[PDB]
């Protein structure tokens, strides 16, 4: 495997570029997708990467093996998922942008999900990171997409309603 | 191999942390050893990692395979070499901190070199990154050392006189 979690990793908030980061260490850094706006007040205090984060990392890594992405992309995808799980504030679920399915499906963390955009009918691929019973928090699991007016790229968060999500 | 140069790599200087970086991309960043003080005015303008850089990367990587280091440390070593070659200002060669050898040897870029410290006789490993006929730019190729009063760690530049350098 390409990157392997190590005792030396540190989460820290970068004041100047306004983004959660991981120190890798050894000259390497990972700048996540998430800025102050989206972090819980935990985030603002450096913390070691712990066994629990290691564990989530290993599961996510395997759950993503078969997504259609560069192994560099899979890494960024899984590292943002840890940031989201650990530090993201609660999200306001989105509904009406996506083709609705008459049944609700229970989606588990680590699942590959599609939604359909209700105007373009373009399929978009997500990774599920957190469940709920109405809403599921997902990360965008493809290089980019345009949603409301907004553009988003790989790693970006969005809470979607379970009736809009579907297995790949 | 693990890190592979990619069209999306960008050199840029980071105003806020005063260091030359490389964007890797995919969330990954590399922070080199080198601050404003040591850069040619080129540095202050972002630039794609180009085919020539890619070439230097590949020879330096191979010339460092058998150094006594972590593959993470070899990565940091080589990346700093690239910064050094591309962007470092001319250096003032040092002389007197190192055990002299009555003959001058010709050292090629890419070479593994030792200097001896003249008071401790401790051996220190370097990586040659530029040649000249008197002076040869080297990066420190071991985790850390103490030289004049200064500390230095892996990736740090110093220009040394060729009579002071010796092959591994």
Author numbering:
A (entry chain A), B (entry chain B): 1 to 168
Paper text:
ZapC has been discovered as a non-essential regulator of FtsZ. It localises to the septal ring and deletion of zapC leads to a mild phenotype, while overexpression inhibits cell division. ZapC interacts with FtsZ and its intracellular localisation is only dependent on FtsZ and none of the other downstream divisome components. ZapC has no clear homologues of known function, it is 180 residues long in E. coli and is found across gammaproteobacterial species.
Phasing, automated and manual model building, and refinement produced an atomic model of very good quality, resolving residues 1–168 of ZapC, with two molecules in the asymmetric unit, at 2.9 Å resolution. Although the fit is good, ZapC contains an extra beta hairpin (residues 141–154) that is not normally present in Tudor domains. In the Tudor domain of ZapC, the extra beta hairpin (residues 141–154) covers the very hydrophobic pocket that in canonical Tudor domains binds the methylated lysine-containing peptide (K36me3, cyan peptide). The structure of the ZapC crystals described here contains two monomers per asymmetric unit. Although there are two other contacts in the lattice, the one shown in Fig.2C clearly has the largest interface, buries a number of hydrophobic side chains and completes the otherwise open beta sheet of the N-terminal chromo domain forming an eight-stranded beta sheet across the two monomers. The dimer interface buries a contact area of approximately 1500 Å2 (out of 8900 Å2 of each monomer). The concentrations of monomeric and dimeric species can be calculated by integrating the baseline-separated distributions, giving an estimate for the dissociation constant of approximately 30 μM for the monomer–dimer equilibrium. Given that L22 was mutated to proline, we think it is very likely that this change disrupts folding in this region of the protein as prolines do not support regular beta sheet formation and the side chain of L22 points into the hydrophobic core of the N-terminal domain. To investigate this conflicting evidence, we probed the direct interaction of a peptide derived from the C-terminal tail of FtsZ with ZapC by ITC (isothermal titration calorimetry) and obtained a KD of 32 μM, as expected for binding of a short, flexible peptide.
